[PDB]
Amino acid sequence: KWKFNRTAFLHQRQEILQHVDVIKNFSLTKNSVRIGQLMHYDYSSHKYVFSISNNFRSLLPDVSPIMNKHYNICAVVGNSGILTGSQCGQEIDKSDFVFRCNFAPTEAFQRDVGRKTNLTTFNPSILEKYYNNLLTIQDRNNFFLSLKKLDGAILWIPAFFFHTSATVTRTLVDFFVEHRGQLKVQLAWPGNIMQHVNRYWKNKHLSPKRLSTGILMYTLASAICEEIHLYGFWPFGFDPNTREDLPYHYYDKKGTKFTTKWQESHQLPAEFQLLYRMHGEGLTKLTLSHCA
């Protein structure tokens, strides 16, 4: 049914590149920050600051981790409940490169979402919510194991979007410095990039207070992928094909009720409408049904 239009996608890549230097915005590098430099937060009041320490700078890459990288078929996997029972795991894992959002689980869900991960995003407040601020030996060990499972994947850590990241970023930084060289995980640390990313999408008549992680991933992916297939983008409470109730997230327990006010800060429906148009124009393949 769906047919890729390579030319139109590459024109979209060029248009994104005119508004966002993706290669650079992908991560701060050692030489782009000074020790003692005060960072601000893209989505918090300007009064919030974070001072760049020696240790933080030592975790930055020397060069963009996506410089001169090229992947043919990319999967960007959002977190919609539409993936549950899709059996898309195998097809996602055939991709050259898979992006995942917010350290999403794969273990109990591989048949549907895959086990391949080449990048996953990581808001530092994950440490507070799921790893008890790395306070105990067992917390530390659980986090270490989760990192080890990523192998050489990129962990894309946006520490300068929300001021609530500030204290937990120091804990994260200390852990990584303490374990330097023990893990193959490639760290990436984007800076204040949402002002640049928002410019491309304002032109496409999309102006939320906040763009979603999913669409941020598409934006990055545009620069390094030749063809992008989207999974788990479907911000609605029902299945499009069956009409049955659907959870918001694929990892939600069965029967969990789609939450209306979960997504009041986002404009996922407007994002989705725009991706859906893009699907129709052959720019990207939006998957909304079970895979083969």
Ligand X SMILES: CC(=O)Nc1cccc([C@@H](OP(=O)(O)OC[C@H]2O[C@@H](n3ccc(N)nc3=O)[C@H](O)[C@@H]2O)P(=O)(O)O)c1
Ligand Y SMILES: *[C@@H]1O[C@H](CO)[C@@H](O[C@@H]2O[C@H](CO)[C@@H](O)[C@H](O)[C@H]2NC(C)=O)[C@H](O)[C@H]1NC(C)=O
Ligand Z SMILES: *[C@@H]1O[C@H](CO)[C@@H](O[C@@H]2O[C@H](CO)[C@@H](O[C@@H]3O[C@H](CO)[C@@H](O)[C@H](O)[C@@H]3O)[C@H](O)[C@H]2NC(C)=O)[C@H](O)[C@H]1NC(C)=O
Ligand U SMILES: *[C@@H]1O[C@H](CO)[C@@H](O)[C@H](O)[C@H]1NC(C)=O
Ligand V SMILES: *[C@@H]1O[C@H](CO[C@@H]2O[C@@H](C)[C@@H](O)[C@@H](O)[C@@H]2O)[C@@H](O[C@@H]2O[C@H](CO)[C@@H](O)[C@H](O)[C@H]2NC(C)=O)[C@H](O)[C@H]1NC(C)=O
Chain centroid offset of residue 6 CA: 24
Q: Does 265 bind ligand X (CB under 6 A)?
A: yes
Q: Count the residues of the shown chain that bind ligand Y, applying the rule CB under 6 A.
A: 20
- 3, 183, 228 from 88: Cα distances, Å: 19, 29, 15
# binding residues, ligand U (CB under 6 A): 6
Pairing of strands 119-121, 154-156: parallel
Provide the CA 118 distance to its chain's centre, in angstroms.
11
Q: Which is nearer to ligand Z, 26 or 234 (CB)?
A: 26
Site map (CB under 6 A) of ligand Z, residues 180-219, x = contact: -----------xxx--x-----------------------
In the 8-state DSSP scheme, what is residue 168?
Answer: H
Nearest distance from residue 272's CB to ligand V, in Å? 22
Amino acid in the structure at residue 88: C
Binding residue ranges for CMP-N-acetyl-beta-neuraminate: 79, 102, 212-214, 234, 248-249
Q: Does 37 bind ligand Y (CB under 6 A)?
A: no
Which residue ranges make up the site for its own copies (CB under 8 A)? 36, 38, 47-49, 51, 53-55, 133, 135-138, 140, 163, 166-168, 170-171, 174-175, 177-178
> Catalytic: which of 46, 179, 266, 290?
266
266 part of the active site: yes
Pick the closest to residue 188 from 150, 133, 214 (CA basis). 150
Q: Which two tokens stand for residue 160?
A: 């300068």
* H helical segments located in 231-284: 268-280
Count other Cβ atoms within 10 Å, centred on residue 11.
12
DSSP codes of every residue in 202-230: HHTT---SS--HHHHHHHHHHHHEEEEEE
Kindly state the smallest distance separating residue 224's Cβ from ligand U, in Å: 14
| Residue 8 near ligand U by CB under 6 A | yes
Q: Which of ligand Z, ligand X, ligand U, none lies near 196, with the C-beta cut-off 5 to 8 A by kind?
A: ligand Z
**Could you give the CA distance from residue 201 to residue 271 in angstroms, rounded to a whole number?**
10
18's CB contacts (< 8 A; 6+ apart) are: none
> Can you tell me the distance from the alpha carbon of 260 to that of 183, in angstroms, rounded to the nearest whole number?
39
Residue among 80 and 169 whose Cβ is closer to ligand X: 80
Among 9, 12, 16, 20, which residue sits at the site for ligand Z (rule: CB under 6 A)?
20
Applying CB under 6 A, among 13, 116, 266, 285 the residue interacting with ligand Y is 116
Residues before each break in the chain (C–N > 2.5 Å)?
Answer: none
Site residues for ligand V per CB under 6 A = 72-73, 227
Which listed option, ligand Z, ligand U, ligand X, none, makes contact with residue 191 (CB within 5 to 8 Å by class)?
Answer: ligand Z
- Please work out the total of residues on this chain that contact ligand Z, with binding judged by CB under 6 A: 8
For the record, the structure tokens of 126 come out as 């994950």
Radius of gyration of the chain (CA): 19
Q: Would you tell me which residues interact with ligand U (CB under 6 A)?
A: 5, 7-8, 72-73, 282
Which residues belong to the active site?
Answer: 266
Q: Would you tell me which residues interact with ligand Z (CB under 6 A)?
A: 20-21, 24-25, 191-193, 196
Q: Would you tell me which residues interact with ligand X (CB under 6 A)?
A: 78-81, 101-102, 212-215, 232-235, 248, 262-263, 265-266, 268, 272
